[PDB]
Amino acid sequence: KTVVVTTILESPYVMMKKNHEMLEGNERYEGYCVDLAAEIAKHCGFKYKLTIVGDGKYGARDADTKIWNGMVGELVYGKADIAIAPLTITLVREEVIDFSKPFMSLGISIMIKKGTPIESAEDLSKQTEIAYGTLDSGSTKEFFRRSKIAVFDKMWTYMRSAEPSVFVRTTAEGVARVRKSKGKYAYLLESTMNEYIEQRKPCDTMKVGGNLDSKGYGIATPKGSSLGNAVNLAVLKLNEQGLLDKLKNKWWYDKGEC
C-alpha cells in the first residue's frame, strides 16, 4: 500500500542531506521534490517511499529495442507507482505515461562559462570553435532530434555527429564540462537548472539569451493509474496556494551563494 516514488539525484530537486548516513528512508533526502512529495502525499492521503532511479536517467526509448529507460521506464514497466522529479512533459512520454498539469514552467536554455562569446542558439549554430551538447536520455536531446526548426535542426545535425561526443550522462557532468572547458564548451539544459547553477559557487557560469522553448514539469504516473486524478488536482491546488513558488524561492535563491 506504500507508494513507490521514483526520483533522481538532481540538485536542488533531490539531494542527500549532509548527515544522510545516520538517517533512514525518506529522511536521507532533501530538496524541492522531497518537499513536494511530502505535500502531495499529505493532500492525496498516502504513504510513500522515495527511491532513486536505478540507471540515473530521466527517460528515453532505445531506438533498437524500443525499451524505455530512466524514470519513465520504471513507470512503464511497473517498478514505480509515481515519479516526482523535474521530469518534462513531452509528446513521446505522454503516449506511454500520464502527467499532471505542470508544477513548474521552464524552457531549454544555454549555459556558458562566463566570458564565452555566445549570446544565442543561432550564434552556436553558426560557429564550430565552441562545442555544445546536452544530457543523454533527456527531453532536450529528444527536442533537438525531432525539431524541424532550421536553427535547431542544424544544431542537432552537428551534435549527433560530433566527435568526441558532446553528450553527457548527468547534468553535473555537463556543468563540470562547461567549467573545465575554459569557454570551449556550451551546455544546453533547462532554464530551471541553468538558473540554479548560476547561483552556486564558484559562480562561473551563466544563462545567456532567452529560452528556446516553453514547457513544464509534471508528476508522472503509469497510464491509467488511479493516483493520477488526485495528484493532478493536488498540483493545481499547491500552485494556486503559492506553495510551489515558495519552494522555488526556498531552494533557488534563499540558499543561493552568489
Ligand X SMILES: Cc1onc(C(=O)O)c1C[C@H](N)C(=O)O
Residue ranges for the known binding site are 86, 88, 93, 139-140, 190
User: Can you name the residues that pair with 132 across neighbouring β-strands?
Assistant: 186
Give the integer Cα–Cα distance in Å for 88 and 211. 15
Q: Is 48 in the site for its own copies (CB under 8 A)?
A: no
- Would you put residue 56 in left (φ > 0), alpha (ψ -120 to 50) or beta? left
Residue 231 contact, options Zn ion, ligand X, its own copies, none, Cβ 5-8 Å cut-off depending on partner type: none
Enumerate residues 6+ apart whose C-beta is below 8 A from 225: 81, 82, 98
- Piece in contact with its own copies (CB under 8 A), picked from 43-51, 157-165, 172-180, 210-218: 210-218
C-alpha cell at 156: 542537432
Residue closer to its own copies (CB basis): 15 or 212: 212
User: In this chain, which residue has its C-beta nearest to ligand X?
Assistant: 138
Residues within window 53-92 making contact with its own copies, judged by CB under 8 A: 89-91
Give the integer Cα–Cα distance in Å for 71 and 220. 9
Q: Is 191 in the site for ligand X (CB under 6 A)?
A: no
Residue 52 contact, options its own copies, Zn ion, ligand X, none, Cβ 5-8 Å cut-off depending on partner type: none
52, 83 Cβ separation under 8 angstroms: no
Q: Count CB atoms within 10 A of the CB of residue 33.
A: 29
**Of the candidates 3, 53, 87, 238, which one interacts with ligand X according to CB under 6 A?**
87
Residue closer to ligand X (CB basis): 42 or 223: 223
78, 4 Cβ separation under 8 angstroms: no
- Piece in contact with its own copies (CB under 8 A), picked from 68-76, 125-133, 200-208, 238-246: 238-246
Q: Is 140 in the site for ligand X (CB under 6 A)?
A: yes
Binding residue positions for L-glutamate: 86, 88, 93, 139-140, 190
Q: Count CB atoms within 10 A of the CB of residue 90.
A: 18
**Count of residues interacting with its own copies (CB under 8 A):** 29
29, 37 Cβ separation under 8 angstroms: no
**Which parts of this chain interact with its own copies (CB under 8 A)?**
89-91, 94-95, 99, 101-102, 105, 143, 146-149, 213-216, 218, 232-233, 236-237, 239-242, 244-245
